[PDB]
Amino acid sequence: KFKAADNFPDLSKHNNVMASQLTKELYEKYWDKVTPNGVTFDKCIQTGVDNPGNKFYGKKTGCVFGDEYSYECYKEFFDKCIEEIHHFKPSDKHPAPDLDHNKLVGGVFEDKYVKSCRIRCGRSVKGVCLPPAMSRAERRLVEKVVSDALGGLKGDLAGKYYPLTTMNEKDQEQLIEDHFLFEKPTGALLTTSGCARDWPDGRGIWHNNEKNFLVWINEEDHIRVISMQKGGDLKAVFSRFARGLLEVERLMKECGHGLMHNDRLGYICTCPTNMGTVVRASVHLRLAFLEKHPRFDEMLGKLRLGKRGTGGESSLATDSTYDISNWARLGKSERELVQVLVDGVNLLIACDKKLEAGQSIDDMIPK
């Protein structure tokens, strides 16, 4: 018999959320505590141990859920991480879902300002393990459950399923051309946490025939779904997004399957960052004039909105064009969070115009 002290990791030179929130006392409490599906605390934290990362750029999360029982099994540790990631207290209750896109208020912007928009999310199937711990048979089941429910979509949501594992050269060139393909993870999170095992077994790409509704099966998560188009019609984007999701879930239930949802935390995925609504509403927004105002970042943060360049995590401004999105994932509903983007974009554009006319925006800015 070893003790937890004997197995406790030296995280002194680490830089991730798990390392900041892990204590020895917590380790001892959860060390030998195992989930229903055989998932361990060491398995939840192993990718953070294997990835000290850097003080220099991007503190990662350093931990993952193995299944739906992982959170409440290791509750004390996870509430700590969630607060750091989210500003969400242990006593905070994430509201019920809300995919009522008719109740969204004017998400139709000028193409002149909004060049393209999108909304994506993550989801998991309840009763299955998450990509870190799940088995081949589990992954195969998820693919059936999901690919089959996507086949039940008609109208503008009608599409087809492209399995990675039988992909041909003909379909593959297409999907690359469309930018819909995904490959085997090479990143450190995904490899070290177990989310690249058994490739390409269980993974596939599904899109609607309109090519404005894309789903990825068994990549980082069971389900990744994106609604997208050029121009400023976020409203059509949320319509499509909401409608597919609600319907997918429904056909899933007909067949005896449901989405992974926690009462306090909402929807569950492999990363603690992907929680609550798990919604990223964003636009590519052209802000020539606002760009150059000093209180631009101040307003943003007050609007609860994030900015980056139009190339992902680490891209700067180019042609005065920004990727604007809701910052929050928990505490608010799906459509509530899309509305933040709507209300925040509206202000942003009106302030840009104000400056183009050479006028003040002091009492346009929030607080």
Added chain:
Amino acid sequence: NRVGHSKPWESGKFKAADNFPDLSKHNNVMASQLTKELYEKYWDKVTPNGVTFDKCIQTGVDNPGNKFYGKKTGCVFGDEYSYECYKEFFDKCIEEIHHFKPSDKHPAPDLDHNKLVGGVFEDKYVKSCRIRCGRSVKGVCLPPAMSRAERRLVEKVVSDALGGLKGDLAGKYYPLTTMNEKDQEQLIEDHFLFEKPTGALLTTSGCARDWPDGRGIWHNNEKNFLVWINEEDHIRVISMQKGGDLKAVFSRFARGLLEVERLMKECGHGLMHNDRLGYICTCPTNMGTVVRASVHLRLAFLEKHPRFDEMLGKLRLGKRGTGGESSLATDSTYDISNWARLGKSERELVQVLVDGVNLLIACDKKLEAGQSIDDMIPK
């Protein structure tokens, strides 16, 4: 619950076939040898340490390769129990890898360097030699599965035993996990250092976990007997020097390995060993003696002979080179080593090198004098 993953055989929803991997396009030993029958049989079976069959084969599943890269092994031993547990599978791999059948038996160890005959060569011919093996610590999981604690234990056992080494076999331990820049600089120049694995096997098998914890470097004062702790295996011992005194290299190698074992016994600790297959390491290529004896040998005339490879292969040896590294092109000089690992003992395998190297050098002189060598070539 070693392997923090879900065990599909536990619900009773899933059969073995539901979990059988598709290895149709794979190019590894494991894929060539796994059957759906064998999966069904071993799917359920779990070692006393909690090591699973899928745990053993996962790396092969995750690394299919092409016809263009080499055929890899594709599996791993989680612990001492792993071979036995999945024996019908493993014997197939062992026979592909080693041409060693389920009825063959690896002989008892022989590290009596005083029974080696004639391993001293002209420095003109042999520019350097070395001998390396891998060893594991009995009663402990192997690098793919072992815990942080297990690896900490091993570090201390092996470091304590290298501790009590005296004579020309004495030196100091440099653990990685409190390495200073001073020692690190030296060791790089010395070519003694090692880093976290980046390659496909070590990563996918769990051999890069928790780095640098439990990992270190030991060497002797003479800088010619070097031990890596808990890199790919618990233990990796290398004996090496410039020039051609292979005999000295084996003596040093043999005596230390025998004394290291002895000192571990002293503290109730043993080397992981199977009566049929010898010493166990993480990779199934690394069995029997797990000894690689090699020389860097100059063959300025023998390169050119058409029957050079026919001889080498009949001598049970293989060629290669460390000349890629050097900013200048090395000569006609090859890393020559014993091909085999299993059916013969360590000192026996060293002798196969000595003997083949004796022939090789004689054939090069022979050619230099304009004489024929056909009659010299074995079979």
